[PDB]
Amino acid sequence: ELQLGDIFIAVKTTWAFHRSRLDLLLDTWVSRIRQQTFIFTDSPDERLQERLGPHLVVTQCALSCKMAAEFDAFLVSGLRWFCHVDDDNYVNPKALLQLLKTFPQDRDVYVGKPSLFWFATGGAGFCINRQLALKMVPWASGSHFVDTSALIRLPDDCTVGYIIECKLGGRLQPSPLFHSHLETLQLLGAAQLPEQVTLSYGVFEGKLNVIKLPGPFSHEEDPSRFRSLHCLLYPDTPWCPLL
Ligand SMILES: O=c1ccn([C@@H]2O[C@H](COP(=O)(O)OP(=O)(O)O)[C@@H](O)[C@H]2O)c(=O)[nH]1
Ligand SMILES: [K+]
């Protein structure tokens, strides 16, 4: 009974990455789940506002103010599930939906890839359902009637985890399906790739960490491998090459 319509996907970006990162996501995974996808940025953009309308949220800025903006928008949506990703993440919404279907519908869930209290690495993507997110509000909002002294010098992903685990007695559910680029991604190939919820690209430990796909785009045309991934997942896409 859970549908794609029940999911609110929030992407964090910034103006300086509109051309270099965001356009890549719009041609790719965001094109398959645009109704559920919200891009949070810090400056307007003609191309994006064209392709996105109210799905481009430009913020004019406990949690950072783009992250607060994502949570507030999610809560206003009324949707059951919040999933946050960065602008170097690829999301497979069909894999996402199947993971989310796996949770009891009346329990608080926080799911993602653990990191060190436990927390879900922001760069791998993570999801929270509405009933948990509503319990987080007093801390997430920086309210004067909770202790947020521990929270002020934590990054957003650790803050989310701290609120959930240390303030609300909750637990991160780990999933191996979420991936950041703080991870040797080259250990995921065309066999594992369609089952993953998120993939990533980026430099880590002096290396450009990317998924292992031979094509169909060259590394020079598609250094992230996201276009190639996208073509693997949706071979009907007319701009896909052969190899
Ligand atoms: O000034 C900035 C720099 C980065 N980002 C966002 O923060 C996330 C991580 O950025 P990046 O991948 O460059 O940082 P890193 O992975 O090195 O931590 C991405 O969603 C970016 O869009 C941002 O909102 N403002
Ligand atoms: K914080």
Ligand SMILES: [Mn+2]
């Ligand atoms: Mn990154």
